[PDB]
Design an enzyme around this catalytic site. Structure first.
Site, PDB file in Angstrom:
ATOM      1  N   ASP A 115     -15.070   2.191  11.271  1.00 37.18           N
ATOM      2  CA  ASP A 115     -15.348   2.365   9.848  1.00 37.18           C
ATOM      3  C   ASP A 115     -15.752   1.048   9.189  1.00 37.18           C
ATOM      4  O   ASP A 115     -15.278   0.716   8.103  1.00 37.18           O
ATOM      5  CB  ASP A 115     -14.128   2.955   9.136  1.00 37.18           C
ATOM      6  N   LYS A 150       0.834  -1.196   0.000  1.00 38.12           N
ATOM      7  CA  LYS A 150       0.000   0.000   0.000  1.00 38.12           C
ATOM      8  C   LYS A 150       0.872   1.251   0.000  1.00 38.12           C
ATOM      9  O   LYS A 150       1.414   1.639   1.034  1.00 38.12           O
ATOM     10  CB  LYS A 150      -0.939   0.005   1.208  1.00 38.12           C
TER      11      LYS A 150
HETATM   12  O1  LIG Z   1      -6.455  -0.143   2.031  1.00 43.15           O
HETATM   13  C1  LIG Z   1      -7.079  -0.093   0.980  1.00 43.15           C
HETATM   14  C2  LIG Z   1      -7.042  -1.242   0.078  1.00 43.15           C
HETATM   15  C3  LIG Z   1      -6.312  -2.357   0.416  1.00 43.15           C
HETATM   16  C4  LIG Z   1      -6.281  -3.434  -0.437  1.00 43.15           C
HETATM   17  C5  LIG Z   1      -5.524  -4.606  -0.102  1.00 43.15           C
HETATM   18  C6  LIG Z   1      -5.165  -4.972   1.176  1.00 43.15           C
HETATM   19  N1  LIG Z   1      -4.463  -6.135   1.053  1.00 43.15           N
HETATM   20  N2  LIG Z   1      -4.333  -6.565  -0.209  1.00 43.15           N
HETATM   21  C7  LIG Z   1      -4.979  -5.632  -0.913  1.00 43.15           C
HETATM   22  C8  LIG Z   1      -6.979  -3.391  -1.619  1.00 43.15           C
HETATM   23  C9  LIG Z   1      -7.707  -2.273  -1.950  1.00 43.15           C
HETATM   24  C10 LIG Z   1      -7.743  -1.191  -1.104  1.00 43.15           C
HETATM   25  N3  LIG Z   1      -8.493  -0.080  -1.479  1.00 43.15           N
HETATM   26  C11 LIG Z   1      -8.500   0.911  -0.655  1.00 43.15           C
HETATM   27  N4  LIG Z   1      -7.838   0.961   0.541  1.00 43.15           N
HETATM   28  C12 LIG Z   1      -7.942   2.142   1.352  1.00 43.15           C
HETATM   29  C13 LIG Z   1      -6.884   3.133   1.016  1.00 43.15           C
HETATM   30  C14 LIG Z   1      -6.060   2.935  -0.067  1.00 43.15           C
HETATM   31  C15 LIG Z   1      -5.086   3.856  -0.370  1.00 43.15           C
HETATM   32  C16 LIG Z   1      -4.935   4.977   0.410  1.00 43.15           C
HETATM   33  C17 LIG Z   1      -5.759   5.175   1.491  1.00 43.15           C
HETATM   34  C18 LIG Z   1      -6.732   4.254   1.795  1.00 43.15           C
END
Ligand SMILES: O=c1c2cc(-c3cn[nH]c3)ccc2ncn1Cc1ccccc1
EC number: 2.7.11.15
Lengths: 616, 57, 339
Positions: free
Chosen positions: A288, A191
């Site tokens: 949330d 991320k």
């Molecule tokens: O954290 C996530 C997110 C995590 C995954 C994920 C976790 N593990 N493998 C994949 C997949 C899609 C996602 N879409 C949004 N966000 C929130 C966000 C994203 C970016 C910035 C702030 C908030």
């Protein structure tokens, strides 16, 4: 890109570093995955006064992991009339009468709980702590542990340490990627936030809070939460290394699959509940909880994602109105309201309702206000469409109450009350945790600048870098740990045999009063240093030390920066200066400590000695 | 306290009770020794390189 | 009181001892030696430079063969040299880095050393089979070991900062006799030729003559205004010299029970660290903190020469038994053989 263990000489530095922090105890080393693996190795192969104790300990651990009572009934007997049993009770240290009486007591009555041999476990540890553990510290297995501990405590991740693949999600501050860690090959999710758009939309308040909440949560290996393993940052990126979940969220699958049945909903709800009990036990509120934050894996199993808006109520209760509208409980929504884990049990009911109907139980008729749901959550009482079952209502009725004093999971036992609802009567929560139940939906494969960063803002991310010791050791153990030890073992035997031929064969740091030793680089030249109470000797390869530096000759030991690298700067009497460079952070910390203690103590001592001290 | 003070005077009495010779006598004996061995002193009279182990032996 | 006169009675004997000594002061060594020719200017050259020690040299001691010598250094090593070839016969890493003194057994079979570890370690040189290892660790002193000298292979005398000296039975490893008397740190000691007596110099600015057998103090010598860092016997054993922080050497005669002469110059202000006589006793060589080794006329009290070949303190020196050479140890980590 492969992992390279430091030479076994790293023990001299690491052991002093760990003992300073009291990390060199039986409990602290045994509790560690790599620590345990090396400890069992020593006990099972290099000390038979503890071999049977370790064999029995592992047999109990296998027993603890058996699901059905059918298995534990058979294994418990097998383990009792096992002859590892009367190999312990028939030798040096047998089990206590009081302990055996309890075990054979429960065992005879035919009830076999997973914690059946727990009395034996504690007595085993009471026999491993002490003389047996002291022999382990003296063994070269602890030396290998120091080699691994050095690598862990010296982790500095960059984008070059990962092979990033396709995107698997996007947010308001960054994107999520499927990547593979270079040294181990473990598949991770990266991320990547962007400080530029973070500082823009006022987001470092979330970016930091998410990193802290993930820390409080990413322990225990919870199968129902997107937990963090690593945390680092480049000049522009904030990076979290999380559990890989390439299956999309529930909001996407909801709008494409249509509303789920009660049976399909019971699955997700069950896994989500365990994910909540995890955080609530660690005194963390999610706040949330919504379908969009529920990620699906390759097999259809789910995890709670994005802990950015979570909170800690361990010592100080939260109050503010935070979360998505339609899923917010009256308590939180009410501000100045000390409102705790009771805020998630409400969000759960609101979320599960949306999986059945297609929207929040307070967002009726497509309304788009934002005082919106706040009116009906506090005032109205959501009343089921009688399409639901008597048990489904009995659940949502309890979860969606306004009173924390009369809501499901808020009257003393928390989640255990929610699991107890007649709606989940058919579920075995043990097998829910093991993810044995079949997912309702298996995801189709392969689809789903005018701003400046000042240094002061970069100082917000000073202590952002982090590493979950539990995650890293686990990753190493299930990948390269065994093979790396094999190579490192023979590579060390290779150097030893060579030193046999050359003829020495006799350690320079033994039989003396040497305080510490190891590799450093001076000025660059890499030498092997020996720290004595009154001098700092060093050598190259191929001969004993010909150069040194007396403690009385040293004026100060200050840390300085050179090429973005931390170095030790030694000020010598003659206006000269000596600069050192360590191979790892732990070595930098210990050398700076040992050198400061050394020269200060020595100068303190020499002054009292007539023949040694400087006269007029 | 006084056992050590008693110890001190007994020591002084043993040091006081000794036969002393005239300094003129003692000084002459020293000089007589130096003269009788001045020939055996390589640091006094620099010896030939032949007899010097640190030059040519 | 009863501590009344025991301090007054003590003072009177001190007056009588001083009176008895004044009664013997009928002439001076300077007056007695005015007829003999001066030794002239004593000039030596460096015949050997012993390289090996990595730090300060604190002490050295010649073997009886006037060829082998041992030295102790700040680098925590004892080195046994062959002064003729400058080759190293033995390099002995020590268990303690804080060594201050070393000694060479008259037989050559053992060397001893010690320091802040408060113990005197005996090392067997001619070994069990081949190597060189600790054969005995003499523990007992409550202070650091400042000096030590072998009487033979099973007897050694030691001085310590614990105010005392001691005679040791090396085999048993215990103290045969304790020599109490000093009120300050004992810095050095010297064995008489007969080895039935020995003198000591301490930080109380006094030297004492001890009976090895009876274990008693026979005579006490004062005069120095500061610490006595070094002491040595005159060849015949009827006198000894001392080096002090007062930048002065002094000659004491036993049978006269007093000082005979003082060796000093207004240019010399640094302290003396070591003293030693030439074979005939005519020359008194002393090491100084000004990097120099001044050669004194023992009889006439003139400075005959100066050995200047070190870039730091001359911490020790010694003349061979055959009187062929003088060795100087320094804080510059070098030993030099002068001739
Ligand atoms: O954290 C996530 C997110 C995590 C995954 C994920 C976790 N593990 N493998 C994949 C997949 C899609 C996602 N879409 C949004 N966000 C929130 C966000 C994203 C970016 C910035 C702030 C908030």
């Amino acid at each position: 890109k492969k992992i390279l263990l430091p030479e076994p000489s790293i023990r001299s530095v690491m052991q002093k570093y760990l003992e300073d922090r009291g990390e060199v105890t039986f409990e602290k080393i045994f509790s560690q995955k790599l620590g345990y693996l090396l400890f069992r190795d020593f006990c099972l192969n290099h000390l038979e006064e503890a071999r049977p104790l370790v064999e029995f300990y592992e047999e109990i651990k296998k027993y603890e992991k058996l699901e059905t009572e059918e298995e534990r009934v058979a294994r418990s007997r097998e383990i009792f009339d096992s002859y590892i049993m009367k190999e312990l009770l028939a030798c040096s240290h047998p089990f206590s009468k009081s302990a055996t009486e309890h075990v054979q007591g429960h065992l005879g009555k035919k009830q076999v709980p997973p914690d059946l041999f727990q009395p034996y476990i504690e007595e085993i540890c009471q026999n491993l702590r002490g003389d047996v553990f002291q022999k382990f510290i003296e063994s070269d297995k602890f030396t290998r542990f120091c080699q691994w501990k050095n690598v862990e405590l010296n982790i500095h991740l960059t984008m070059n340490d990962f092979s990033v693949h396709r995107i698997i999600g996007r947010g308001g501050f960054g994107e999520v990627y499927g990547c593979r860690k270079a040294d181990t090959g473990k598949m991770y999710a990266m991320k990547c936030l962007d400080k530029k758009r973070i500082k823009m939309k006022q987001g470092e308040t979330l970016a930091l809070n998410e990193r802290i909440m993930l820390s409080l949560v990413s322990t225990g290996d919870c199968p129902f939460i997107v937990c963090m393993s690593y945390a680092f940052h480049t000049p522009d990126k904030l990076s979290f290394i999380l559990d890989l979940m390439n299956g999309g969220d529930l909001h996407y699958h909801l709008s494409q699959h249509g509303v789920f049945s009660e049976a399909d909903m019971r699955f997700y709800a069950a896994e989500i509940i365990l994910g909540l009990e995890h955080m609530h036990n660690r005194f963390v509120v999610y706040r949330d909880l919504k379908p969009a934050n529920i990620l699906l894996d390759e097999h259809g199993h789910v995890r709670i994602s994005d802990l950015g808006l979570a909170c800690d109520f361990s010592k100080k209760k939260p109050h503010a109105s935070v979360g998505t509208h339609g899923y917010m409980a009256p308590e939180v929504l009410q501000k100045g309201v000390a409102y705790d884990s009771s805020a998630d049990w409400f969000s759960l009911g609101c979320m599960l309702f949306k999986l059945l109907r297609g929207h929040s139980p307070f967002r009726q008729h497509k309304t788009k206000d934002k005082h919106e749901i706040d009116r009906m959550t506090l005032t109205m009482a959501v009343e089921l469409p009688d399409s639901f079952s008597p048990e489904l209502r009995s659940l949502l009725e309890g979860l969606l109450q306004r009173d924390v004093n009369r809501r499901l999971g808020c009257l003393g036992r928390g989640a255990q009350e929610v699991k107890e609802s007649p709606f989940f009567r058919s579920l075995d929560w043990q097998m829910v945790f093991l993810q044995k139940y079949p997912p309702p939906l298996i995801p189709p494969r392969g689809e789903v600048k005018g701003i400046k960063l000042l240094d002061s803002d970069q100082e917000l991310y000073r202590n952002f870098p982090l590493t979950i010791s539990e995650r890293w050791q686990q990753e190493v153990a299930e990948t390269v740990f065994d093979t790396i030890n094999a190579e490192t073992d023979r590579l060390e035997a290779r150097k030893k045999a060579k030193n046999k031929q050359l003829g020495h064969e006799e350690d320079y740091a033994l039989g003396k009063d040497c305080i510490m030793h190891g590799y450093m680089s001076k000025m660059w030249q890499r030498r092997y240093f020996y720290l004595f109470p009154n001098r700092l000797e060093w050598r190259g390869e191929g001969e004993a030390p010909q150069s040194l530096l007396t403690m009385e000759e040293i004026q100060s030991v200050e840390e300085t920066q050179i090429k973005e690298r931390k170095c030790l700067l030694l000020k010598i009497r003659g206006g000269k200066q000596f600069i050192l460079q360590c191979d790892s952070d732990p070595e930098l910390v210990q050398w700076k400590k040992e050198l400061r203690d050394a020269y200060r103590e020595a100068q303190q001592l020499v002054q009292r000695v007539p023949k040694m001290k400087n006269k007029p | 306290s006084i056992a050590q003070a008693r110890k001190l005077v007994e020591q002084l009495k043993m040091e006081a009770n000794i036969d002393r010779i005239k300094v003129s006598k003692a000084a002459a004996d020293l000089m007589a020794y130096c003269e009788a061995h001045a020939k055996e002193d390589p640091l006094l009279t620099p010896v030939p390189a032949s007899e010097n182990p640190f030059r040519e032996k | 009181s009863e501590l009344d006169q025991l301090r007054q009675e003590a003072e009177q004997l001190k007056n009588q001892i001083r009176d008895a000594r004044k009664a013997c002061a009928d002439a001076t060594l300077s007056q007695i030696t005015n007829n003999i020719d001066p030794v002239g200017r004593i000039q030596m050259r460096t015949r050997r430079t012993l390289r090996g020690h990595l730090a300060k040299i604190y002490a050295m001691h010649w073997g009886t063969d006037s060829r082998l010598l041992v030295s102790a250094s700040q680098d925590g090593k004892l080195i046994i040299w062959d002064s003729y070839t400058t080759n190293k016969v033995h390099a002995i890493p020590l268990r303690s880095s804080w060594v201050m003194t070393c000694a060479y057994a008259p037989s050559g079979n053992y060397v001893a050393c010690g320091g802040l570890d408060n113990i005197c370690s005996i090392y067997n040189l001619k070994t069990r089979e081949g190597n060189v290892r600790v054969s005995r660790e003499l523990a007992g002193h409550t202070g650091y070991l400042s000096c030590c000298r072998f009487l033979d292979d099973n007897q050694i005398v030691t001085s310590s900062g614990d105010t005392t000296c001691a005679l040791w039975d090396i085999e048993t490893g215990q103290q045969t006799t304790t020599f109490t008397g000093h009120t300050g740190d004992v810095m050095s000691l010297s064995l008489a030729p007969d080895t039935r007596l020995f003198v000591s110099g301490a930080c109380d600015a006094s030297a004492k003559l001890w009976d090895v057998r009876e274990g008693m103090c026979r005579q006490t010598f004062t005069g120095h205004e500061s610490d006595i860092n070094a002491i040595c016997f005159f060849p015949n054993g009827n006198a000894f010299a001392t080096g002090s922080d007062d930048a002065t050497c002094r000659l004491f005669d036993l049978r006269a029970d007093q000082e005979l002469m003082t060796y000093s110059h207004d240019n010399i202000i640094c302290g003396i660290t070591s003293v030693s006589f030439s074979k005939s006793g005519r020359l008194l060589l002393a090491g100084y903190d000004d990097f120099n080794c001044n050669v004194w006329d023992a009889l006439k009290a003139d400075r005959a020469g100066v050995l200047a070949g070190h870039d730091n303190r001359v911490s020790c020196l010694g003349v061979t038994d055959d009187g062929m050479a003088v060795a100087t140890g320094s804080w510059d980590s070098f030993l030099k053989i002068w001739n």
